[PDB]
Amino acid sequence: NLYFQGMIPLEQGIEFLSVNVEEDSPVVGKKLKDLPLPRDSIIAAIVRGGVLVVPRGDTEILSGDKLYVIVSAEAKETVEETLLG
Amino acid sequence: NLYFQGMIPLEQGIEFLSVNVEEDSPVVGKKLKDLPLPRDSIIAAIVRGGVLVVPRGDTEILSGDKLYVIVSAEAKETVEETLL
């Protein structure tokens, strides 16, 4: 199947992006509620084996997950570094 | 000031869309936790007066809000009907 990968602008100063979680990403095995994310960032959705996972605080991020993120321009690089290193 | 409006596919069977909340919207003043939504749907973000609002269960939708939604193909019409 075709799929979204990369980033698109939503508004003045807000972007939508995808993150592919690799085996060595620092977020692997962490629960969403325990991630030190900037206040202007959102883990909007997880796609896992092609299936939508609705994120909740107790959701554990796994190797191979695809994350969809909404984030301010100011916070984008910090969120990416938090997720991927 | 350019902006996203409409819908795009993300994956097979998953769509990303925007909704503009008007004064006649059935969901005005409702908390997100109280909205009747199908399993495969997510209120991904709110933009309010140009500012990002992180959706929480107790977040109230206001007239004029812009919602960004992630939904399965199968759930999309149901979500649009609930919100609009």
Side-chain angles (χ1 to χ4, degrees), chain A residues 4 16-18 42-45 47 66-69, chain B residues 10-11 70:
Chain A
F4 178 110
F16 180 68
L17 65 94
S18 64
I42 307 165
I43 306 308
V47 179
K66 186 176 187 175
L67 311 183
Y68 286 104
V69 176
Chain B
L10 298 183
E11 310 281 339
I70 294 171

Side-chain angles (χ1 to χ4, degrees), chain A residues 19 25-27 37 75-76 78-85:
Chain A
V19 173
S25 296
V27 298
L37 292 174
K76 184 255 194 178
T78 301
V79 179
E80 279 194 314
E81 291 176 15
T82 294
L83 294 173
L84 300 180

Side-chain angles (χ1 to χ4, degrees), chain A residues 2-4 8-11 14 16 40-42 44-45 47 50-55 66 68 70-72, chain B residues 2-4 8-12 14 16 39-42 44-45 47 50-55 66 68 70-72:
Chain A
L2 292 173
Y3 55 86
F4 178 110
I8 72 172
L10 298 182
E11 313 281 334
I14 305 168
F16 180 68
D40 38 0
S41 75
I42 307 165
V47 179
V51 174
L52 184 64
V53 174
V54 173
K66 186 176 187 175
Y68 286 104
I70 295 170
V71 63
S72 68
Chain B
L2 297 179
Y3 55 88
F4 180 107
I8 67 168
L10 298 183
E11 310 281 339
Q12 183 180 278
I14 308 171
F16 177 71
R39 187 189 69 192
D40 295 333
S41 68
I42 306 163
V47 181
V51 176
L52 184 63
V53 174
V54 173
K66 189 171 180 179
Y68 284 101
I70 294 171
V71 61
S72 69

Side-chain angles (χ1 to χ4, degrees), chain B residues 16-29 31-75 77-82:
Chain B
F16 177 71
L17 63 94
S18 68
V19 170
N20 274 74
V21 182
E22 308 286 350
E23 292 189 35
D24 70 339
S25 156
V27 296
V28 175
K31 294 172 192 192
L32 296 185
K33 66 190 176 179
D34 293 327
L35 299 178
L37 300 166
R39 187 189 69 192
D40 295 333
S41 68
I42 306 163
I43 308 303
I46 295 164
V47 181
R48 175 176 298 165
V51 176
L52 184 63
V53 174
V54 173
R56 311 288 196 191
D58 298 335
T59 306
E60 294 166 319
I61 297 170
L62 306 181
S63 74
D65 281 354
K66 189 171 180 179
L67 314 183
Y68 284 101
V69 174
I70 294 171
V71 61
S72 69
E74 286 181 3
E77 195 162 41
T78 298
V79 175
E80 293 167 0
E81 288 182 25
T82 291

